[PDB]
Amino acid sequence: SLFRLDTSILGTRSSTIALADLVEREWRATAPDPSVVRRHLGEDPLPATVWAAAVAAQFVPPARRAPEEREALSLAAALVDELVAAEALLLAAPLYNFGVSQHLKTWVDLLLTDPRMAAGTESPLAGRPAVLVTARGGAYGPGTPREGWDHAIGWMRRIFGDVWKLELTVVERELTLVGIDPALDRFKELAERVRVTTEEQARAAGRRLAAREGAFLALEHHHHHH
Amino acid sequence: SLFRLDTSILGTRSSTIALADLVEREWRATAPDPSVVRRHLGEDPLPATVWAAAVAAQFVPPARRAPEEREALSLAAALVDELVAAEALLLAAPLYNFGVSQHLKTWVDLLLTDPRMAAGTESPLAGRPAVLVTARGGAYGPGTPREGWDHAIGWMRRIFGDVWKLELTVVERELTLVGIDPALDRFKELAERVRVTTEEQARAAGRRLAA
Ligand SMILES: Cc1cc2nc3c(=O)[nH]c(=O)nc-3n(C[C@H](O)[C@H](O)[C@H](O)COP(=O)(O)O)c2cc1C
Numbered sequence: 001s002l003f004r005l006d007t008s009i010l011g012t013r014s015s016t017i018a019l020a021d022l023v024e025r026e027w028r029a030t031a032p033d034p035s036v037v038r039r040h041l042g043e044d045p046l047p048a049t050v051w052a053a054a055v056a057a058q059f060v061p062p063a064r065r066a067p068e069e070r071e072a073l074s075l076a077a078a079l080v081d082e083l084v085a086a087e088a089l090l091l092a093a094p095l096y097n098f099g100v101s102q103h104l105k106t107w108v109d110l111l112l113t114d115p116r117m118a119a120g121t122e123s124p125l126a127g128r129p130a131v132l133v134t135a136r137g138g139a140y141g142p143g144t145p146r147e148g149w150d151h152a153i154g155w156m157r158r159i160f161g162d163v164w165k166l167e168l169t170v171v172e173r174e175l176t177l178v179g180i181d182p183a184l185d186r187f188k189e190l191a192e193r194v195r196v197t198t199e200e201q202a203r204a205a206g207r208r209l210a211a212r213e214g215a216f217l218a219l220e221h222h223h224h225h226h
Numbered sequence: 227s228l229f230r231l232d233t234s235i236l237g238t239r240s241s242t243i244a245l246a247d248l249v250e251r252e253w254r255a256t257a258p259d260p261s262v263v264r265r266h267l268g269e270d271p272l273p274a275t276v277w278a279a280a281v282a283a284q285f286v287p288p289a290r291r292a293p294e295e296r297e298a299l300s301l302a303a304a305l306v307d308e309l310v311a312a313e314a315l316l317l318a319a320p321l322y323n324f325g326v327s328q329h330l331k332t333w334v335d336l337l338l339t340d341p342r343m344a345a346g347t348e349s350p351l352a353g354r355p356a357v358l359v360t361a362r363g364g365a366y367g368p369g370t371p372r373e374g375w376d377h378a379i380g381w382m383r384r385i386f387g388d389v390w391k392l393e394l395t396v397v398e399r400e401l402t403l404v405g406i407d408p409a410l411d412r413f414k415e416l417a418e419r420v421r422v423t424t425e426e427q428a429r430a431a432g433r434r435l436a437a
Pocket residue numbers: 008009010013014015016017094095096097098099135136137138139176177281
């Protein structure tokens with residue numbers, strides 16, 4: 001099955017929801033399991049109290065735990081349950097105020113309270129494919145005035161890439177505030193070609209996710225010594 | 227007055243609360259208008275629904291806004307009020323899961339929905355002194371396997387330094403899990419020696435804040 005996490009708060013005007021939708025159409029089209037499990041933290045955020053309670057329970061004989069502590073670690077397990085149930089991941093995290101979504105950080109903070117996701121434990125997701133959909137208002141690449149101002153990209157890549165050891169495909173649509181903020185009207189055409197191109201890339205990542213089981217069984221080089 | 231923010235969820239065991247007191251002690255003791263307004267997002271988190279509500283309200287005509295939409299923009303205005311009202315700032319944010327405190331970003335997200343904090347407007351806090359107390363369980367210095375693995379320090383510096391234009395002094399304690407993680411006993415005395423140093427760095431910051 002595919003697991004889909006949306007974190008956008010802008011509803012129907014969401015670039016990330018729209019790009020993720022194009023990825024999902026491709027999954028359902030070519031995937032052996034077109035099934036999709038979804039969670040929308042943007043509409044249904046995880047409460048801001050449950051993390052602290054889980055961190056406390058984490059080292060307490062389960063019986064000496066308190067109502068909120070237990071309910072907190074139970075919820076952590078349900079969220080891990082969803083990730084370990086999916087053969088592939090679609091995670092849509094837009095750029096807000098130069099950093100991580102409050103909703104994405106919350107979700108990840110609480111996941112990492114579940115024993116199966118602690119530190120030093122082997123990721124139960126290693127090798128599994130993930131498409132990450134981000135968008136930005138302005139342009140953030142090398143040589144722009146906003147180079148190194150996306151403090152989110154690197155964090156999500158360390159968690160999904162280096163910690164969870166997921167196989168990561170990234171779809172970034174920059175210039176989503178072009179036509180919205182006049183100060184970016186020197187970008188009108190660039191912004192358009194960017195959109196069309198990243199729409200294909202979102203279609204592309206969906207096709208590639210769908211076929212990853214096949215592509216792994218067709219893989220022969222396994223670096224045995226010789 | 228002094229404005230103090232805590233984000234720690236560790237209570238009695240916080241390295242950042244401990245270090246932040248050292249700054250505040252220097253304030254109250256040797257500072258004029260020595261009053262201290264404080265807010266502990268670790269004990270009293272801002273609701274997780276309030277940022278979206280404030281962002282959405284700005285698209286609904288004012289005359290027809292929903293109480294929850296009006297209520298969120300009021301709360302944003304009150305957190306801005308706190309900051310605009312202080313001569314100095316004391317902001318304590320630990321490193322959590324390689325990234326930013328979930329509560330610090332919510333607070334910053336909802337601050338920036340107020341029209342005084344908005345893009346294109348001048349920082350109403352520009353030039354104001356600010357001490358940032360942060361702590362790490364590991365060592366994230368140049369030359370270490372964990373270099374570039376603190377994705378928080380850069381982001382807080384962008385908001386507080388580059389957007390808010392505060393004259394920002396950072397006090398940072400590392401190796402806060404030496405003694406808790408058995409695999410760090412190779413640092414028992416170094417760990418202790420960074421503690422006493424950052425404590426004195428914390429007292430230093432206080433004095434110059436009070437000056
Ligand atoms: C509260 C808020 C903060 C934003 N912060 C940034 C920012 O720091 N940098 C940026 O390039 N765009 C920023 N944007 C613009 C968004 O990145 C853009 O609207 C993007 O499409 C958001 O994804 P979504 O539409 O799927 O929610 C922000 C938008 C909002 C509503």
